[PDB]
Design a protein around this ligand. Structure first.
Ligand SMILES: [Mg+2]
Ligand SMILES: [Mg+2]
Ligand SMILES: [Mg+2]
Ligand SMILES: [Mg+2]
Ligand SMILES: [Mg+2]
Ligand SMILES: [Mg+2]
Ligand SMILES: [Mg+2]
Ligand SMILES: [Mg+2]
Ligand SMILES: [Mg+2]
Ligand SMILES: [Mg+2]
Ligand SMILES: [Mg+2]
Ligand SMILES: [Mg+2]
Ligand SMILES: [Mg+2]
Ligand SMILES: [Mg+2]
Ligand SMILES: [Mg+2]
Ligand SMILES: [Mg+2]
Ligand SMILES: [Mg+2]
Ligand SMILES: [Mg+2]
Ligand SMILES: [Zn+2]
Lengths: 192, 126, 136, 133, 37, 23
RNA sequence: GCCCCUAAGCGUGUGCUAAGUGGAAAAGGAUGUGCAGUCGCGAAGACAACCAGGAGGUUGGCUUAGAAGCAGCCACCCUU
């Protein structure tokens, strides 16, 4: 499990503020802040479209190599600001990471398969948080449900993980719950 | 159907052709699936009957010197390979065409050469 | 009919329409959801009608979550009454809905019927609404 | 040019065949007597019959092998099929009965070998929700 | 000849067209013929 | 309601700058 | 504000609009059109059009007057 850094160009922000931020967003750019253990924050602006393509390809936790005026920097997408309505990316928080470093990351969980036809599958956790090497974080985690009978609970302990990644959250976290399929009359009392 | 599937079909057709002593190219327009099942019943014991795309066989024909069969691919294409012997499928196709009357014998390939209708009819008599 | 069991004050000012939603802006329970685009009071009976519509279209499987609860009351004076003499009695319950709020959530196997049922729901609401999913 | 399913030892039922055979230009009494003789020779199972007609009102009846549904039902010992196949299992069938029915269907089907007919019968039992062992 | 603010292709045979600035639905089934008025 | 609509609509002129007395 | 009434531009450059929209209005309906962006297929021949095929098990069971691929239900396979 090895991931290659994604190449993006960054420009140091001449001016910071809300006016500057709105102008930059209008110019097809996204503002961001790069900070890390080095105790040295930098205010940058990125190309929105390239950044969005990178996120589409490699999820919300993607390793990045940034070209700050000819200097290559390794960074991780620590946080995002997505507008609720327009669903843009208003701001990015990037975390400075070096090779062979352990970081805490929230990785999404998706399910596949076909359980017993008389059952309904519900997902209670969108993501679980994991300790992993900076370049070795997994794109996503999968849980397979098939032949699952009646009330069966899948917890964070039972989920499978790649090699070299450690799960931090308590295994008691109910991720997926398989329940008996609600009957036709069962839908009429909920919400009444 | 993917282009990778087209390449796989080309490879499979080439592999089947390499093990076949002869082949017969015929026309099948106007035949029900019951008729094709009867033809398979007769041929499936020893020979092989297939129908494939014209250009897919054309690319699959570039392997050996059967590249001259391309002019027989204008119209419906039905291939008959002879895994057992060489001419049992020849009589099988000829009798099937005579009985059904909807089959036209485009030609055959034997001994490294492509032969026409009368030539194939003469060869089947051998 | 969703009615709160009890409210501390039975006569309240109108919930304010300013701003856009801050919380509950993303689907969290089910696979699919209805996101609002307009500011409105949504009553309990509109919620009931929309819920019944989803249930009838979906029939057996799947589960429906309602993230909105009508706990804010609105009052009216009795008919043909001149202005004055105190506030009227409260007689319908509403929920303050801002754009970006996710109202309903649905969990059902297939895409098409889920979208259709949600659309049947939106056709029962006094707002512009759209359908959203778990994925970004 | 029709095909029906009719009890072996019974002839002239009103709902299934009567009006069905009346509007196809087929004489019914001769067909019934010949079919009764043939299925009393068979005497074992209800049968499907295919009727081919000519321009002189001449009728030819083709009697196929007993249906896979009825053969599996009689080999498994049950009378009616499962109302919820693959959820409720009402019978169990071993490979010997499967291979007997496979030989019968080889006499009936286009399958090149007995194993193909056995797989067809296994699929038929799957539509019946009956385990094949 | 339905005359409604909302016209839709009831069955798969229905076609939606525009004639003289009006949205119309035409179909082999005469019931399904309708216009936006 | 045409009269009130027309007054409150001519509110929106270039010269009035979006406001008129009596709305 | 600048065609004439009515003082001053039927101003210049690049696009859009066919509705006299401009010169009133909602939920909602819709192959109107322009721009920008994704995904699918496609000369290894795409879509349309088009000639020929689309079979056997078998009417898969339960359900019934009836169930034959086409009340419903449940399964929903094999051969060429
Ligand atoms: Mg206030
Ligand atoms: Mg809050
Ligand atoms: Mg929230
Ligand atoms: Mg609405
Ligand atoms: Mg209507
Ligand atoms: Mg009015
Ligand atoms: Mg006012
Ligand atoms: Mg004047
Ligand atoms: Mg003048
Ligand atoms: Mg001007
Ligand atoms: Mg001019
Ligand atoms: Mg001008
Ligand atoms: Mg111009
Ligand atoms: Mg006008
Ligand atoms: Mg309008
Ligand atoms: Mg609409
Ligand atoms: Mg448009
Ligand atoms: Mg039925
Ligand atoms: Zn129609």
């Amino acid at each position: 499990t090895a991931n290659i850094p994604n190449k993006l160009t960054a420009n140091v922000r001449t001016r910071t503020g809300k006016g500057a931020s709105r102008q930059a967003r209008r110019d097809g750019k996204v503002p961001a802040v790069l900070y890390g253990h080095g105790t040295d924050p930098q205010h940058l602006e990125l190309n929105a479209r390239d950044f969005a393509a990178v996120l589409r390809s490699h999820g919300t936790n993607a390793i990045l190599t940034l070209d700050i005026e000819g200097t290559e920097q390794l960074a991780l997408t620590k946080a995002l600001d997505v507008h609720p309505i327009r669903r843009n990316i208003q701001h990015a928080d990037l975390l400075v990471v070096q090779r062979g470093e352990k970081v805490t990351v929230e990785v999404t969980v998706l399910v596949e398969g076909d359980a017993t036809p008389g059952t309904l599958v519900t997902q209670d956790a969108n993501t679980i948080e994991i300790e992993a090497e900076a370049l070795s974080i997994p794109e996503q985690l999968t849980v397979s449900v098939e032949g699952v009978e009646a009330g069966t609970q899948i917890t964070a302990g039972q989920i499978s993980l790649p090699e070299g990644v450690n799960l931090i959250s308590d295994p008691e976290l109910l991720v997926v719950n398989v329940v008996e399929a609600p009957s036709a009359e069962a839908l009429e009392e909920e919400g009444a | 159907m993917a282009k990778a599937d087209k390449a796989t079909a080309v490879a499979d057709i080439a592999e089947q052709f390499k093990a076949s002593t002869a082949t017969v190219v015929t026309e099948y327009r106007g035949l029900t699936v019951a008729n094709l099942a009867e033809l398979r019943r007769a041929l499936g014991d020893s020979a092989t009957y297939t129908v494939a795309k014209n250009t897919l066989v054309k690319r699959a024909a570039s392997e050996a010197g059967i590249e001259g069969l391309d002019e027989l691919f204008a119209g419906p294409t039905a291939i008959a390979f002879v895994k057992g012997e060489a001419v049992d499928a020849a009589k099988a196709i000829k009798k099937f065409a005579k009985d059904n009357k909807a089959l036209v014998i485009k030609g055959g390939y034997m001994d490294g050469k492509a032969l026409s209708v009368a030539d194939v009819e003469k060869i089947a008599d051998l | 009919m969703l009615i709160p069991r009890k409210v501390k004050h039975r006569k309240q000012h109108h919930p304010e329409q300013r701003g856009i939603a801050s919380g509950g802006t993303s689907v969290s329970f089910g696979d699919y959801g209805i996101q609002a685009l307009e500011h409105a009071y949504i009553t309990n009976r509109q919620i009931e009608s929309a819920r019944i519509a989803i249930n009838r279209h979906i029939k057996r499987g799947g589960k429906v979550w309602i993230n909105i609860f009508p706990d804010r009351p609105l009052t009216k004076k009795p008919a043909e009454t001149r202005m004055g003499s105190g506030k009227g009695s409260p007689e319908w319950w509403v929920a303050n809905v801002k754009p970006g709020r996710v109202l309903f959530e649905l969990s059902y196997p297939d895409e098409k019927t889920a979208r259709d049922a949600l659309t049947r729901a939106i056709h029962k609401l006094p707002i512009k609404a759209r359908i959203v999913t778990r994925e970004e | 040019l029709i095909k029906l399913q009719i009890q072996a030892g019974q002839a002239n039922p009103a709902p299934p065949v009567g009006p069905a055979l009346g509007q196809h230009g087929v004489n019914i009494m001769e067909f019934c007597k010949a079919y009764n003789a043939a299925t009393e020779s068979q005497r074992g199972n209800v049968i499907p019959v295919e009727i081919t007609v000519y321009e002189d009102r001449s009728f030819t009846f083709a009697l196929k092998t007993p249906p896979a549904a009825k053969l599996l039902l009689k080999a498994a010992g049950v009378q009616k099929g499962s109302g919820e196949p693959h959820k409720t299992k009402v019978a169990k069938v071993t490979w010997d009965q499967v291979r007997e029915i496979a030989e019968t269907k080889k006499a009936d089907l286009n399958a090149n070998d007995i194993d193909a007919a056995a797989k067809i019968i296994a699929g038929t039992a799957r539509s019946m929700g009956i385990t094949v062992e | 000849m339905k005359v409604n603010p909302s016209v839709k292709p009831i069955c798969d045979k229905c076609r939606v067209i525009r004639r003289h600035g009006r949205v119309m639905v035409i179909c082999s089934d005469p019931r399904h013929k309708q216009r936006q008025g | 309601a045409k009269r009130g609509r027309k007054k409150r609509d001519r509110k929106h002129s270039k010269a009035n700058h979006g406001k008129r007395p009596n709305a």
